[PDB]
A paper describes a structure:
While these cTRP constructs have many favorable properties, we have previously noted that their ability to self-assemble from smaller subunits is compromised by relatively limited contacts and small surface areas that are involved in packing between repeats and subunits. Based on those results, we hypothesized that a new generation of computationally designed cTRP proteins with increased repeat size (corresponding to longer secondary structural elements that increase both particle thickness and the number of buried contacts between repeats and protein subunits) would improve both the energetics and the stoichiometric control of self-association.
To validate the accuracy of the tcTRP9 particle (harboring nine repeats), the recombinant protein was overexpressed and purified, its apparent molecular mass analyzed by size exclusion chromatography, its thermal stability verified by circular dichroism (CD) spectroscopy and its crystal structure determined. CD spectra collected at 22° and 95° were nearly superimposable and indicated the presence and retention of the helical secondary structure after heating (right). Superposition of the design model and the experimental crystal structure produced an rmsd value for all alpha-carbons of ~0.5 Å, and close agreement between side-chain rotamers within the inter- and intrahelical repeats and interaction surfaces. The only positions where the side-chain rotameric conformation significantly differs between the design and the structure is for a pair of leucine residues (L11 and L37), which interact with one another through van der Waals interactions between their side chains in both models. Repeats from tcTRP9 and tcTRP24 are shown with darker shades and lighter shades, respectively. a Alignment of the sequences of an individual repeats from each of the two designs.
Author numbering: 1 to 513
Write the structure that this text describes.
Amino acid sequence: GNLELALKALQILVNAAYVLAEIARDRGNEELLEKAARLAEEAARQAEEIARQARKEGNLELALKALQILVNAAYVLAEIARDRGNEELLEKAARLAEEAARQAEEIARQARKEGNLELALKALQILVNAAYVLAEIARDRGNEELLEKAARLAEEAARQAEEIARQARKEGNLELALKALQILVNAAYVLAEIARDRGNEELLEKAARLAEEAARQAEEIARQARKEGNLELALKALQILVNAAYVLAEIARDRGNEELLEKAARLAEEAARQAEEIARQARKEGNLELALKALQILVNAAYVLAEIARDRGNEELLEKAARLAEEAARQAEEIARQARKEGNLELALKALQILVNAAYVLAEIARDRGNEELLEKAARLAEEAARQAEEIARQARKEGNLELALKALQILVNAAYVLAEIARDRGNEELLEKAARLAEEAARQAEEIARQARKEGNLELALKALQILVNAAYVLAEIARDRGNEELLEKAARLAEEAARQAEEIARQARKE
């Protein structure tokens, strides 16, 4: 009776259904769409059963993980339904999302009574996630009543998160305060998305106040944590500053406010400058994991700046974003190299992941600029990561370290995704086919590892392998997308149905246990 392991399997089931739904749409295959809906519905049916058992036993953490699957299932059912006019599916999706929101609010109440503020914020994140799914459904159906309910759910989450941040400060617990600020940012993003259903100016202004409230406090918390020498805390705060700036840019973009656009960009640049200084300090002290966390903020800040620059081809911001991403790529390469010399292969893989993420941001900038050399530089970064990933995977499997191997295969899938996107940017069939083969190799090794894991009875390991299958199948679907590649869509559908079927078997065994 391993409920945590069963839920992990069901999340894989939802993720596979989501991928099959995307493949079914690209190919107009109504039968495949029906199959994806049943998988998503079956995942939600079992998750809702597990939610009930978890709460009966008082395991609120497990119950929240079950509610998240309800929400993800609802999202998948709404994505399937909106193309056609499938009101019966949208109603099921709304029912699931509303049930998740209700239970989330009940658990937030109970968590706060018992003084468990971290649990309460996890309940509020589910509340925000359910509000997001409801907002999409309500926008599809032109149901203003339900849009109003989604907005009220997001606002309730932000209101409670504001209260918990104040309690957290009073207990000196700034880490917890930051988790509350992240709820504010996520709630603000949902409200702005709801307000973008034509001129709800009062909702947009509410969303902007929330995001600005989080930015202001994240910036001050980062400054103080850094002055007190608490670098790990400062970076968490800088991530929230970047996330707040992203939402402010979306609000600014929508409301045509060039002033707010510029403010959002300054916040993102300030976060990147602080992260750059923290990375240099962390490497001076020899703290490579810290340093890599700083570099990912550089990439995230650069991604925000490039998005801000999108519409109007802003020359300063695009070149600023380019230098930030290249800075992170170079330092990640250096750290990967040192980590591999010191035999620290997990650290090396984290560095390659930052390299892939930097390369993705550079490819976006190169694309918008028609910059051939930067596109080529981005592809070389992605190809460097993929090559090092398969070397680490090969050695990991040789020594029987399957978890390490799977982490390396995930890097390979991510690098293939970046290379696929560059291949789109050049209209190059050859590069596109090379990216697909990188993804196919990763999927092939992941299937064999899943088989070896299950033969040994290691179901936790096998589920991690199945997730790579899902992610690989998603990359293959993105490559065949808008190209009419029937051969590739079939390989993608095959991988996602493989993961789905094995996830179902593992869920069943975990529930017996």
